[PDB]
Amino acid sequence: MRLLYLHADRFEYKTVKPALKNPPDPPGEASFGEALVVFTTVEDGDGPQTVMYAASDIASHSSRLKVTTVILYPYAHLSSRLAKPMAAHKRLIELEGALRTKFPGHVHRAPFGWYMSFSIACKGHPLAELSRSFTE
């Protein structure tokens, strides 16, 4: 699993055209104030241990930033060892579930399988932009 943690002042996205023949999640949009935006690329190795490692780290980092909202934002482009789409979708649902057992704030999982528009205003402070990798 490859993640990018962006500490945003604001974030918004809108699904556009479907990127898969059958996106598993309905189309939509949302916007937010201060939030940790987590661009998430599910990799072939990812299983339950990986999800739990990622959930814990996300929770921990959010704690250090005093953020109260985490956006789980599916992203195909952070690595070149992607999981297949149905496995990736399952992992992301598991990650949302796991994160709720470790982080007390709002957890929003963006829809999976779509081309997206978005806007982010990303903070400039030293921890506002970090990358993570998790495996088992």
The single residue among 20, 68, 108, 133 that binds ligand A3T, judged by CB under 6 A, is 20
For position 93 contacting ligand A3T by CB under 6 A, the verdict is no
What percent helix, strand, coil does the chain show, rounded to 5? 25, 40, 35
Among 20, 65, 87, 116, binds a second copy (CB under 8 A): 116
Applying CB under 8 A, does 4 fall inside the site for a second copy?
yes
Binding mask 52-91 for a second copy (x = CB under 8 A): -------------------------xx-x-----------
Assess 118 for contact with a second copy (CB under 8 A): yes
Amino acid at 14: K
- DSSP three-state, residue 120: strand
Among positions 33, 115, 135, 136, the unique one binding a second copy when judged by CB under 8 A = 115
Sign of the Cα pseudo-torsion (51, 52, 56, 57, in order): negative
Residue whose C-alpha is closest to residue 63's, from 97, 105, 108: 105
Q: Verify binding: residue 30, a second copy, rule CB under 8 A.
A: no
The CA–CA distances, whole Å, from 58 to 52, 72, 91 equal: 10, 10, 15
Which residues would be at the binding site for ligand A3T (CB under 6 A)? 19-20, 40-42, 74-76, 82-83, 85, 88, 112-116, 129
